[PDB]
């Protein structure tokens, strides 16, 4: 009857595009890794969009994030594996939530804006 | 830890002048444009011919150096 708590969840093609921009941002130092760093970037206001894993045990520990996202008008996605998120994030350990921050002199600007456009139409 | 490396390319036999004609690409990292006599020696022991018979000329080092 209701939605699942994870929703909106991403299709596989959008997931590939998301993880590509995640890896290039982690290469160019734009990516904050972890739920605490993501919440801190949401408070400081520096984030561009949020990726969240939709299978961590349990789901509420990062489900605290969409409330801040809705109150500050940030888009967020839910990808289906924290294992793949940690791998494409470049950590030796699964990450459940990541925050792509904003920058203006960034080499990946239109890549971030393309995927963020896809997310904003996903919502 | 250096190694000159010779790679012949486009070997064309020519029995009219009784020879073979090709292009020689040399790789020489951390080294400055290996001598023509040493290249004659190495090419001779590669093709099993004589140092007094093998001939090389017309070299050009790439910009940045190392080929």
């Amino acid at each position: 009857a209701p939605n699942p708590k994870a929703f909106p969840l991403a299709d596989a093609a959008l997931t590939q595009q998301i993880l590509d921009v995640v890896q290039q941002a982690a290469n160019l130092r734009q990516l904050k890794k972890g739920a605490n760093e993501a919440t801190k970037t949401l408070n400081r206001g520096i984030s561009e969009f949020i990726i969240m894993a939709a299978d961590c045990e349990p789901i509420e520990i990062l489900l605290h994030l969409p409330l801040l996202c809705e109150d500050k008008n940030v888009p967020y996605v839910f990808v289906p594996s924290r294992v793949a998120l940690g791998r494409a994030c470049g950590v030796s350990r699964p990450v459940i939530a990541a925050s792509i921050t904003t920058n203006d002199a960034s080499a990946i600007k239109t890549q971030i804006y393309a995927v963020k456009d896809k997310i904003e139409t996903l919502l | 830890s250096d190694a000159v490396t010779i790679r012949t390319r486009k070997v064309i036999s020519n029995p009219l002048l009784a020879r073979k004609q090709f292009v020689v690409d040399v790789l020489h990292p951390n080294r400055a444009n290996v001598s023509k006599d040493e290249l004659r020696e190495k090419l001779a022991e590669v093709y099993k011919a004589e140092k007094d018979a093998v001939s090389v000329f017309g070299f050009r080092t790439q910009f940045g150096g190392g080929k």
Partner: protein, 54 residues
């Protein structure tokens, strides 16, 4: 110090394409991305070695 692929490119007006945009890195002959340090660094090491040897 900077090489696009393998070529040590020293022009600041180069107009990179996409493949170059991903391939830009420090040149392998530089003291930043490779072999022995510069003349200032090894001269400082030499003079410190001398001042310890005397």
């Amino acid at each position: 110090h900077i090489a696009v692929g393998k070529q040590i490119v020293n022009i600041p007006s180069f107009m990179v394409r996409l493949d170059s945009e991903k391939h830009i890195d420090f040149a392998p002959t530089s003291p930043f991305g490779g072999a022995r340090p510069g003349r200032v660094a090894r001269r400082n090491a030499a003079r410190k070695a001398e001042a310890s040897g005397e």
